[PDB]
């Protein structure tokens, strides 16, 4: 009599963040840090966009920290452009998750 649909699971995350520099060798190193042997990036120039599976975990917070040692974490949450899923940063790490309900 009634139907419904659901999509509570990982699919594809589209993290969008401003661009700067050294994001090429940084993204490559930030990609190897994670077993993302099946992801695609979309760096135009002004901004940096990615397309991961959904459940990823980055620990290259150091490489991202060095990019601007003379700063804070507020810059991170500031360097935001757009998103698709969720994300959770740790002491010195950044994990991305597409899953809605957690």
UniProtKB/Swiss-Prot annotation:
Matches recorded under InterPro entries: MOase_MmoB_DmpM, mOase_MmoB_DmpM_sf
Disruption phenotype: Cells lacking this gene show a complete loss of toluene-4-monooxygenase activity.
Gene3D superfamilies: Monooxygenase component MmoB/DmpM (3.90.56.10)
Keyword annotations from UniProtKB, A to Z: Aromatic hydrocarbons catabolism
Superkingdom of the organism of origin: Bacteria
Pathway assigned in UniProt: Xenobiotic degradation; toluene degradation
MF GO annotations: monooxygenase activity
BP terms from Gene Ontology: toluene catabolic process
Known partners and oligomeric status: The alkene monooxygenase multicomponent enzyme system is composed of an electron transfer component and a monooxygenase component interacting with the effector protein TmoD. The electron transfer component is composed of a ferredoxin reductase (TmoF) and a ferredoxin (TmoC), and the monooxygenase component is formed by a heterohexamer (dimer of heterotrimers) of two alpha subunits (TmoA), two beta subunits (TmoE) and two gamma subunits (TmoB).
Family: Belongs to the TmoD/XamoD family.
General function of this protein: Effector component of the toluene-4-monooxygenase multicomponent enzyme system which catalyzes the O2- and NADH-dependent hydroxylation of toluene to form p-cresol. Required for optimal efficiency and specificity of the holoenzyme.
Protein name per its UniProtKB record: Toluene-4-monooxygenase system, effector component
Organism: Ectopseudomonas mendocina (Pseudomonas mendocina)
Record gene name: tmoD
């Amino acid at each position: 009599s009634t139907l419904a649909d659901q999509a509570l699971h990982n699919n594809n995350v589209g993290p969008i963040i401003r661009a700067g520099d050294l994001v090429e060798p940084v993204i490559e190193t930030a990609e190897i840090d994670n077993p993302g042997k099946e992801i695609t990036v979309e760096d135009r120039r002004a901004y940096v966009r990615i397309a991961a599976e959904g459940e990823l975990i980055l620990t290259r917070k150091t490489l991202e920290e060095q990019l601007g040692r003379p700063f804070n974490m507020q810059e991170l949450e500031i360097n935001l452009a757009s998103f698709a899923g969720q994300i959770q940063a740790d002491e010195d790490q950044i994990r991305f998750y597409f899953d809605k309900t957690m």
